[PDB]
Every structure is written in structure tokens, then in C-alpha cells.
Ligand binder design. Structure first.
Ligand SMILES: [Br-]
Ligand SMILES: [Br-]
Ligand SMILES: [Br-]
Ligand SMILES: [Br-]
Ligand SMILES: [Br-]
Ligand SMILES: [Br-]
Ligand SMILES: [Br-]
Ligand SMILES: [Br-]
Ligand SMILES: [Br-]
Ligand SMILES: [Br-]
Ligand SMILES: [Br-]
Ligand SMILES: [Br-]
Ligand SMILES: [Br-]
Ligand SMILES: [Br-]
Ligand SMILES: [Br-]
Ligand SMILES: [Br-]
Ligand code: NA
Ligand SMILES: [Pt+2]
Ligand SMILES: [Pt+2]
Ligand SMILES: [Pt+2]
Length: 129
């Protein structure tokens, strides 16, 4: 599914991401924009053999099982395919574990490089929230 910007903001708010670990909704929406362009089916192979999955490009080295990342863990206790669903629940639940890991949203390199310190409220501007 390719979400609209305000459609995704609404879903993320419904699932409890607004101000989760102190990160306003705009941060999450900005992260999703640059990670996946709001496409739940986005995948990206990494040089280390792991793969990033879904709207927030969650990685198989630590977070999900894809059966093809040697030495990896599955800390979200899910198949990586769950992260590609039109229903963002698995991605949101897993993102909550990731952002609590100690480095906050710096876990998403695209957030650090493209969202952090910017006017992230622009990403939710206009939306019925
Ligand atoms: Br947009
Ligand atoms: Br929109
Ligand atoms: Br909704
Ligand atoms: Br919910
Ligand atoms: Br929930
Ligand atoms: Br929550
Ligand atoms: Br915001
Ligand atoms: Br990681
Ligand atoms: Br594996
Ligand atoms: Br393996
Ligand atoms: Br594990
Ligand atoms: Br699993
Ligand atoms: Br949803
Ligand atoms: Br959720
Ligand atoms: Br879940
Ligand atoms: Br933090
Ligand atoms: Na894994
Ligand atoms: Pt939820
Ligand atoms: Pt929650
Ligand atoms: Pt939902």
C-alpha cells in the first residue's frame, strides 16, 4: 500500500506513535517519507546481507526473521514479511522497540540525515488530527 501523507499520520497516531519516546508525529512521518516514500512494500538489500522492510525500513539483522540473514536475531518476534502489510501494526510495534533501544530515532539513518533538526511539523500540516 502507498499511503497518503495525512493518511499515514492518522494511522501512526491511532497506533500510539505521536510523542512516543518524545518523538512528535512529524518525526515519524518524515522518517517514513525518506525510508519508503510511504510504501509498505518497500524492501532494500544491504551490503551485509540483511534487508530493510516496510514503511520504516526495519532491518533483519536484529529485528525480524527473513530466513536469509546469517547470525541475525528477531527481537520483534515477527517474520520480516509482516512489515510489508497494508496494516502498519507490526511496523509500529517493532518501531517502538527500536526507538527504545538507546539511540532514539538515530537508529534510522535517513531520519538522522534528512529529518533531525528540520521543521518536521510540516509533515503533518493540513492533516485532520
Ligand atoms: Br509527501
Ligand atoms: Br495528504
Ligand atoms: Br486511521
Ligand atoms: Br491501535
Ligand atoms: Br498499540
Ligand atoms: Br503505545
Ligand atoms: Br510534529
Ligand atoms: Br539496528
Ligand atoms: Br536468518
Ligand atoms: Br541464514
Ligand atoms: Br531473537
Ligand atoms: Br517469526
Ligand atoms: Br493501519
Ligand atoms: Br500498533
Ligand atoms: Br505485531
Ligand atoms: Br531520545
Ligand atoms: Na533476523
Ligand atoms: Pt496499534
Ligand atoms: Pt503501544
Ligand atoms: Pt491501522
Amino acid at each position: 500500500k502507498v499511503f497518503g501523507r495525512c493518511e499515514l499520520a492518522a494511522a501512526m497516531k491511532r497506533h500510539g506513535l505521536d510523542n512516543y519516546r518524545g518523538y512528535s508525529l512529524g518525526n515519524w512521518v518524515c522518517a517514513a517519507k525518506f525510508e519508503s516514500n510511504f510504501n509498505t512494500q518497500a524492501t532494500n538489500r544491504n551490503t551485509d546481507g540483511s534487508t530493510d522492510y516496510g514503511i520504516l525500513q526495519i532491518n533483519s539483522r536484529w529485528w525480524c526473521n527473513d530466513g536469509r540473514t546469517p547470525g541475525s536475531r528477531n527481537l520483534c518476534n515477527i517474520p520480516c514479511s509482516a512489515l510489508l502489510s497494508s496494516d502498519i501494526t507490526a511496523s509500529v510495534n517493532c518501531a517502538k522497540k527500536i526507538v527504545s533501544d538507546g539511540n532514539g530515532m538515530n537508529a534510522w539513518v535517513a531520519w538522522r540525515n534528512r529529518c533531525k533538526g528540520t521543521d518536521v511539523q510540516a509533515w503533518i500540516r493540513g492533516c485532520r488530527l
